[PDB]
């Protein structure tokens, strides 16, 4: 089997990407933020709490004829934003561009922390990164992909992400027309529950290529690329009147700017970002400073591909039993 469903922008700055979900019978369609970076498939639904729902669609498992009560189970998961969410458990049929899964743990929330509740187009997150992490307790449980693995043509999903634009979720197939050139695959360790894998390097703009390590994580649930201080600093040296700004959480610079472009290696490949992609506006409305798209990792703990990063590539998630990432220009 195969699934192919479109993935939209928010808003006009790509802050996050939705894609809509069937779940239960008859389908209830919830548009989710698929997160490559956690592991919990949870929803808005009838049960959280009332003055926490603001817009959202909401899961009913009392209206889904394939909604089972997982018994005594319950979530509760905290983001690197600082948001959060906990809830009990249902079981459901799931279905996302056409490929199905039955029994699919589907966490239906009752509490959910402001920054949900103030986003009213996200209706919950899909989550993608390796089940060793879901939240899920006593009894963890499998995400989506996990689930359909076995049944996919091959145990892969793939996401391709538009700038300014919808894009693509892929699984169980790789489309061999959205993308240029070869796919370069690269190794990936498991050991902390993500996609976690090391480039090569980087350049600035035209700038000569740096050959360094950087180990990070492929995370779509994240807006932005965090890396170390150095490379942070070497790209915003090049924007004049760039600077970080402790009050406002980052490097600001000039909205009058035209900023550089910024590659990065995937193996001996180069994946580059369009300085465009690395604009994210005004701090505040009317304001002419704007946020930069590349950011530091120090105190994070770790470097972050988000979707700044994952939108200029074609990317290959690949669940065989050694996984490994793909990386393609498009």
Sequence with gaps: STGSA????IDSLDDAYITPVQIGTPAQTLN????????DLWVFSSETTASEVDGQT????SKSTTAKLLSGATWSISYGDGSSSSGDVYTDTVSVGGLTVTGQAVESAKKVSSSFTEDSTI???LGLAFSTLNTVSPTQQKTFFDNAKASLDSPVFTADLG???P????????DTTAYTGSITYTAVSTKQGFWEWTSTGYAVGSGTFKSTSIDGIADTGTTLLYLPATVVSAYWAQVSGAKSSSSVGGYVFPCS?????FTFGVGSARIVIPGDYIDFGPISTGSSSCFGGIQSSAGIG?????DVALKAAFVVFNGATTPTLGFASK
Excluded at 6 to 9: A, G
Excluded at 32 to 39: A, I, M, R, V
Aim: charged share 10%; hydrophobic share 30%.
């Design 257 to 261: 700017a035209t900023l550089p472009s």
């Design 123 to 125: 209706d919950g997150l």
């Design 163 to 165: 700038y300014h634009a």
């Design 6 to 9: 479109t993935t939209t922008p």
């Design 302 to 306: 770790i470097n972050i591909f988000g």
């Design 167 to 174: 894009g693509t979720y892929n699984f169980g197939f790789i």
């Design 58 to 61: 909401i899961y009913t498992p």
């Design 32 to 39: 989710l933020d698929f997160d490559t970076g956690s592991s």
